[PDB]
Design a protein around this ligand. Sequence first.
Ligand SMILES: *C(C)[C@H](C[C@@H]1CCNC1=O)NC(=O)[C@@H]1[C@@H]2[C@H](CN1C(=O)[C@@H](NC(=O)C(F)(F)F)C(C)(C)C)C2(C)C
Ligand SMILES: *C(C)[C@H](C[C@@H]1CCNC1=O)NC(=O)[C@@H]1[C@@H]2[C@H](CN1C(=O)[C@@H](NC(=O)C(F)(F)F)C(C)(C)C)C2(C)C
Lengths: 305, 305
Amino acid sequence: SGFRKMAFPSGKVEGCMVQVTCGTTTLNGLWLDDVVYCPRHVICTSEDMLNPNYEDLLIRKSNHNFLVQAGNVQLRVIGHSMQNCVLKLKVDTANPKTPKYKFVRIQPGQTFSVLACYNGSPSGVYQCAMRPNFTIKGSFLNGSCGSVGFNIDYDCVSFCYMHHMELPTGVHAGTDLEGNFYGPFVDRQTAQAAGTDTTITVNVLAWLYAAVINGDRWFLNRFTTTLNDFNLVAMKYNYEPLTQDHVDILGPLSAQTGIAVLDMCASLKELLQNGMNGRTILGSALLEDEFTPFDVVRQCSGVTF
Amino acid sequence: SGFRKMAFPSGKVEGCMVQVTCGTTTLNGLWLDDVVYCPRHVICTSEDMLNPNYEDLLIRKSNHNFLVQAGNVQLRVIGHSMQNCVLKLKVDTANPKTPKYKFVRIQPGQTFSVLACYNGSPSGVYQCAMRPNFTIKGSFLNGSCGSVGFNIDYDCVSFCYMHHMELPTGVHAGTDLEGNFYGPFVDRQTAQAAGTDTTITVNVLAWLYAAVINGDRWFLNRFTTTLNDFNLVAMKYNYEPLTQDHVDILGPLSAQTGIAVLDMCASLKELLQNGMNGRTILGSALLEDEFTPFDVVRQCSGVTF
Ligand SMILES: *C(C)[C@H](C[C@@H]1CCNC1=O)NC(=O)[C@@H]1[C@@H]2[C@H](CN1C(=O)[C@@H](NC(=O)C(F)(F)F)C(C)(C)C)C2(C)C
Ligand SMILES: *C(C)[C@H](C[C@@H]1CCNC1=O)NC(=O)[C@@H]1[C@@H]2[C@H](CN1C(=O)[C@@H](NC(=O)C(F)(F)F)C(C)(C)C)C2(C)C
């Protein structure tokens, strides 16, 4: 028993982290096969980042301008190209620790483990949910760019996030591994703000199922509801509309606990209208929406990798 | 910016996890050099665990009764010995992924990363604080025993916890890597309960410093206090007495923020007497005590490994 925010084991990703230095700017890169992926603002000076012309900056750089270091070993750059907001550096050495991997673009509401890195060295790992406003509530300092987010399916590492920038509210924005930003953000040091966020309803329900599985059942009421009714009450509290796809995705948890999704919706409806009355659910005084239905099943069934 | 519960990168520990099977019982083991460490109740049947005589059970086992598997490779056991509640299995192969490591017995209030494992395979990683009652608020299922807790200092992995059992309240208890349990618990399936826990005061203060560093300063009041006065107010709320050693340990954070420890104690004194008034600190509606002063510095300064 027990339910904890749980990151994937980072070993497979730790073996892919390198340091990328261009001039005086240093950040992290992902070394997969003979290609190093890193944010393209590695080629910017502190002045360029205010309004950079990345295509122009990349002209004046040759392969030798990019210092790639895996540990103490320098990786010789034999090619460079820009794909959206990511820079692809071809190196003369294929990473022998390359895991089976994919590049995926996750959807809002899905979670992933972030391996925070500095100077190509892993610092720590934590879980993040892609917020509906396409930000993540991460912990990133100077030099953390290039740190990647990932999920692990058996032996396959699905990279889905590379860190680029921090927004005024302290939240963070980045790109997929193809360099496409999540959300309407750009890799320029200019006025940008995250849109108004919303609560990932399906994840709250998943978390309530986790609570029941772990013996925390005080919030279960006698009632049921309809998908239409619940969504009208949840809309007021800035909850995403619960779709039938979300109901279907919760099926496994509903079947395991014997609590219909719409019965759990009634309990959440009451929690949203009446509050928690000073009580906790899984030790939390707030409703948690950063656990996907998969995260709950994975943790309550012990899926390994 | 941003402050998150952050685990150490688990790669160095993932390379040491093996599966240990004795008869029908399977759990995890730590493979360091040519020795596999695992809980001794691997040698118990479901019946033995109610009142096991481990010394007796170990008589009837020979080296070949212990099936150790690193991945698909079986490690041949060439020796076995029992140290307290841990079993040491000598194998004919030294783990080539053995990191620089130590065995340490952490103190109550210190944190460590847990690598949850099943069948010798890492499932996930999360941070845990050794509670004053010598339990941890973990997430463990059947077959999770042998999962270890650790800290990483540069390149040295300090193993400090091996999981053994779960207590009635859903909290968890285990041993150091020498087999000595944390707390008054025994590896027997019998009536055992965790003592009344207490709040790790120094960690709350560290967490309040983290809040200030991250711009959350609404709780800072104009007052100071004395170590004696604060401790008398904090005692009522089940807070550990704050020692001068704790004040000294907070020095780095006090110096970085320019807020004296006793000034922060006054702010915590007010938070304990008046509550948070529906507000959050670092997104939390409760005061967090699972962040050590080191954890805060490590995360707010970007210490890597
Ligand atoms: C990557 C190394 C670094 C990570 C951030 C530094 C502190 N915390 C982080 O997450 N990214 C940057 O420095 C990016 C880069 C330059 C400016 N920048 C920012 O993150 C800045 N934010 C913004 O400009 C915005 F729009 F998000 F508000 C700032 C946090 C440094 C002010 C690039 C876009 C090239
Ligand atoms: C290790 C494989 C396993 C981990 C627990 C199973 C579920 N969650 C866990 O953390 N440990 C055990 O099964 C230990 C073993 C047997 C009984 N046991 C327990 O954890 C049991 N708890 C207790 O007896 C006590 F005292 F903590 F309440 C129980 C949770 C299975 C009932 C040993 C002590 C040999």
